[PDB]
Amino acid sequence: SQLSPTELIEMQNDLFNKEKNRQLSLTPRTEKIEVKHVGKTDPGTVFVMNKNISTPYSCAMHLSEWYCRKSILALVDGQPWDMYKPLTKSCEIKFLTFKDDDPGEVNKAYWRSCAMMMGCVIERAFKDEYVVSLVRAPEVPVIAGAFCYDVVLDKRLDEWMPTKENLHSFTKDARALIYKDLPFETLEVEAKVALEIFQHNKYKLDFIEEKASQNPERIVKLHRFGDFIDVSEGPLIPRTSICFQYEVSAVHNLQTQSSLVRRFQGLSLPVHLRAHFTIWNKLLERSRKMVTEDK
Amino acid sequence: TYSSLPDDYNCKVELALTSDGRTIVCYHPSVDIPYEHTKPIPXXXXXXXXXXXXXXXXXXXXXXXXEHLEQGPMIEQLSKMFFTTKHRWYPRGQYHRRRRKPNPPKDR
Amino acid sequence: PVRRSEKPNWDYHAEIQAFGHRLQETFSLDLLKTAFVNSCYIKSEEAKRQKLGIDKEAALLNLKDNQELSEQGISFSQTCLTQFFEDAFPDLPTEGVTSLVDFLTSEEVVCHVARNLAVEQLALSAEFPVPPPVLRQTFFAVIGALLQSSGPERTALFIRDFLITQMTGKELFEMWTITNPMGLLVEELKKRKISAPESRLTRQSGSTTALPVYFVGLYCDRKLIAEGPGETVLVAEEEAARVALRKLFGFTENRRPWDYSKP
Amino acid sequence: TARGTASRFLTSVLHNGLGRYVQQLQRLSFSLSRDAPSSRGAREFVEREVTDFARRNPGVVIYVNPRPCCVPRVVAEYLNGAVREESIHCKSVEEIAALVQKLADQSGLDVIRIRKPFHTDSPSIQGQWHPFTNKPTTLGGLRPREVQ
Numbered sequence A: 001s002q003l004s005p006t007e008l009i010e011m012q013n014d015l016f017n018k019e020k021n022r023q024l025s026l027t028p029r030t031e032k033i034e035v036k037h038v039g040k041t042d043p044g045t046v047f048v049m050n051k052n053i054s055t056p057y058s059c060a061m062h063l064s065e066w067y068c069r070k071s072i073l074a075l076v077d078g079q080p081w082d083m084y085k086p087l088t089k090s091c092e093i094k095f096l097t098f099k100d101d102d103p104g105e106v107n108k109a110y111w112r113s114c115a116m117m118m119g120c121v122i123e124r125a126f127k128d129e130y131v132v133s134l135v136r137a138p139e140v141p142v143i144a145g146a147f148c149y150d151v152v153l154d155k156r157l158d159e160w161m162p163t164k165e166n167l168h169s170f171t172k173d174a175r176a177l178i179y180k181d182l183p184f185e186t187l188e189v190e191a192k193v194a195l196e197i198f199q200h201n202k203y204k205l206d207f208i209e210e211k212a213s214q215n216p217e218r219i220v221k222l223h224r225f226g227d228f229i230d231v232s233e234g235p236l237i238p239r240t241s242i243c244f245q246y247e248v249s250a251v252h253n254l255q256t257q258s259s260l261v262r263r264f265q266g267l268s269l270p271v272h273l274r275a276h277f278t279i280w281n282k283l284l285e286r287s288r289k290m291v292t293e294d295k
Numbered sequence B: 001t002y003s004s005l006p007d008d009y010n011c012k013v014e015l016a017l018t019s020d021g022r023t024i025v026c027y028h029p030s031v032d033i034p035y036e037h038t039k040p041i042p043x044x045x046x047x048x049x050x051x052x053x054x055x056x057x058x059x060x061x062x063x064x065x066x067e068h069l070e071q072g073p074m075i076e077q078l079s080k081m082f083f084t085t086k087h088r089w090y091p092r093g094q095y096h097r098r099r100r101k102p103n104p105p106k107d108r
Numbered sequence C: 001p002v003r004r005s006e007k008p009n010w011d012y013h014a015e016i017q018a019f020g021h022r023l024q025e026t027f028s029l030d031l032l033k034t035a036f037v038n039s040c041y042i043k044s045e046e047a048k049r050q051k052l053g054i055d056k057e058a059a060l061l062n063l064k065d066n067q068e069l070s071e072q073g074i075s076f077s078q079t080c081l082t083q084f085f086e087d088a089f090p091d092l093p094t095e096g097v098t099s100l101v102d103f104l105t106s107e108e109v110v111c112h113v114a115r116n117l118a119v120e121q122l123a124l125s126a127e128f129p130v131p132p133p134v135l136r137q138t139f140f141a142v143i144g145a146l147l148q149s150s151g152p153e154r155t156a157l158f159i160r161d162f163l164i165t166q167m168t169g170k171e172l173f174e175m176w177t178i179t180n181p182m183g184l185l186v187e188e189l190k191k192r193k194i195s196a197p198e199s200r201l202t203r204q205s206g207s208t209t210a211l212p213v214y215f216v217g218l219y220c221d222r223k224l225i226a227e228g229p230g231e232t233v234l235v236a237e238e239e240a241a242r243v244a245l246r247k248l249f250g251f252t253e254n255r256r257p258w259d260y261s262k263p
Numbered sequence D: 001t002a003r004g005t006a007s008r009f010l011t012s013v014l015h016n017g018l019g020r021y022v023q024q025l026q027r028l029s030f031s032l033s034r035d036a037p038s039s040r041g042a043r044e045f046v047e048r049e050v051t052d053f054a055r056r057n058p059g060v061v062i063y064v065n066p067r068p069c070c071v072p073r074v075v076a077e078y079l080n081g082a083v084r085e086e087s088i089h090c091k092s093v094e095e096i097a098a099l100v101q102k103l104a105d106q107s108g109l110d111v112i113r114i115r116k117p118f119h120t121d122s123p124s125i126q127g128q129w130h131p132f133t134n135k136p137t138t139l140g141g142l143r144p145r146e147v148q
Helices: A005-024 A056-060 A065-070 A104-123 A164-179 A191-199 A204-216 A277-286 B055-060 B071-082 B096-100 C012-022 C029-035 C040-051 C057-061 C067-088 C096-104 C107-116 C132-149 C152-162 C174-176 C181-191 C233-250 D037-054 D093-105
Strands: A032-037 A044-048 A073-076 A079-082 A092-098 A130-134 A145-153 A184-190 A219-225 A228-231 A243-255 A260-270 B013-019 B025-026 C196-203 C215-218 C223-230 D025-032 D061-066 D073-078 D083-087
Touching: A005 A184, A005 A191, A005 A228, A044 A056, A056 A065, A056 A092, A073 A104, A079 A104, A079 C233, A092 C174, A104 A130, A104 A164, A104 A219, A104 A228, A104 A243, A130 A204, A145 D093, A164 A243, A164 B055, A184 A191, A191 A204, A191 A219, A191 A228, A204 A219, A260 A277, C012 C029, C029 C067, C029 C132, C057 C215, C057 C233, C067 C096, C067 C132, C067 C152, C096 C107, C096 C174, C107 C132, C132 C152, C174 C223, C174 C233, C181 C196, C181 C233, C196 C233, C215 C233, C223 C233, D025 D037, D025 D093, D037 D061, D037 D093, D073 D093, D083 D093
Parallel strands: A032 A092, D025 D061
Antiparallel strands: A032 A044, A073 A079, A073 A092, A130 A145, A145 A260, A184 A219, A219 A228, A243 A260, B013 B025, C196 C215, C215 C223, D025 D073, D073 D083
16 A cells, blocks of 8 residues: 555545535424523523524624624533534523633644644655654643644654754744644544544554543544544634743653654744743743643 | 848848849748857756744744734835836825726727 | 627627638638527527527527537538648647647637627627637638638638738747757757757856846757856746747747748 | 816727728717708708718618707717717818718717827837847857956
């Protein structure tokens, strides 16, 4: 088997599109679903929407632009939903923001999102001659000063460690990614049809195995933006626009016996919370340390 | 061998008079530029934009050029570039671009 | 836009007769009437005959569309032009006469000439703006119809009058579109047993200006085969290549204007 | 005023006159009134001239309508798609004949100020001047101050 870089991307997107078509071809034929607003602004507000098509974002378009722009994450019953996930049965919806009193749910949803971006930054930035295997997106708590992604690289490429030029280029391509506006999309896949998309990454295939194993229906949660697809835990933030300052700060070589795993550590803030040029240097200092919470 | 103008540029010229006298015939073949007068084509290219670590980032750092300046400084750079005064470079009123011809007559 | 046939003054027979009389051509009126009939007009006529309960079919199937005539027309037309260019410019390659013929027979050009001869007005078809693929068929139908009534000798003159003339003022690589001037020049020089095309820089004004000007000459064994202007050394090379190609192939500003004589 | 109108360069329709001359007038339609006086001239032109004019110009179709109409008009129509209107209203027979003969030989291209008297293609035969055309060449293409 011999594969081109663009071919694999296309194939993944085709698998994903086949998925979508198969999810939509369930023939709901526009069934009426009912949502209620339990939020504190307009209580006793009802929404008659279209089951498994209409979204909690499409529910914000009824209120005002303010909701559309401010709300990162929806709290529907006992679950956070992300804005672009269609809705299943009758629900009750509350909207979450960065300035709310228990933003934590959103915060976890930020790092996850932010981490995923740095995937695109990396895999596509390498020479055709080498090989980049993305491993997992280890979830650190927010008090640790960074977000981290795990990466394995070609064995002959393993001796050199990055230069401030390379780092700055990572940052630059990240911000260039933020520049064009990318929506985030959520799909529910079976382990059988999920294991076919990732393939060549063994760590993806095994992570999928464990993750889908712990939950009885063998369900994998996929997140697609642009040409990139990634499996993660929990919901993501609605648009790429929301991320303002992006930095790829440090990269650290960690070595196990059977694997050489590099951490990519970075820092980012939302356009809502954006911080001053002095503070940014202070936090960009703390993101240089090797930050370990895996378990 | 007499010619009023040198044969060293444009055309070599020959003025003859018809035997009868009623016609001036004029023979002017083109002068090809001699090879000894030319210089070799300048060919200068250096691509060092490439980093040895990653070539996709090395050819993604070729589209990394951009800036935005103020109206005034921009105008001074444009007029320096084309060797113009700085007045030509300013916008035009509504009234003027309303009345610019939509379809200018094209010849040949 | 409305059909002239639907407007106040119309006599279709008078128009048909006049058409031929003004170009000085002899058509059996049967063949010409045949020529302006389109499959679209027939299909619409059948739609109306079916939806109104009107009995048409026999005499409407007797209408004999322009298909055969149009095919005769295009085949003889391309044959004719190909012979013209082959005999006029001996040095053009197969691909060249191919492209020129392709250009005179192009949708645009034929549409234009047909529009101005009042072929669009006299054509029977659905949808009065008369889309280009229709108008083309309609136009060549006339040609085939001439080929029947008059010998190939007459149709020769007609084609060279209302078609070849469209080529007045236009350049070669305007209708060739070939994007590799250099390689093709090298090929043609190899085919001519001519050795080494060499790019050499002749005159240049300003190299530091936003507006430089270059002249590249091309040398085959110290002789200057062609020369051209440009904004860069590359564009200049391309231009000299164009010029060389033009001399070799024979399409040049100096070439004799196209003959018109009537034997 | 010449700054008031549009303009065209000198033009022929369909490169007319090269291969052959194609008379550009296509249809000519008169509307007169048998009863009313203003059409008097228009009447005589129909009796005497229209026959010989039609014989002389085989190409143009001539439509003639008597109708209850007060201002006799002739509508020229061109191979070009151009349409030109005239009133033959209250004119002599020599005047109608003359007008029709003016219509006959026009192109149908609009009468509008023509920019320059001639349309040339390939005006440039044997060369077209460029600043370098008459300057002498030097050795090795050296600049004014250069050293090789």
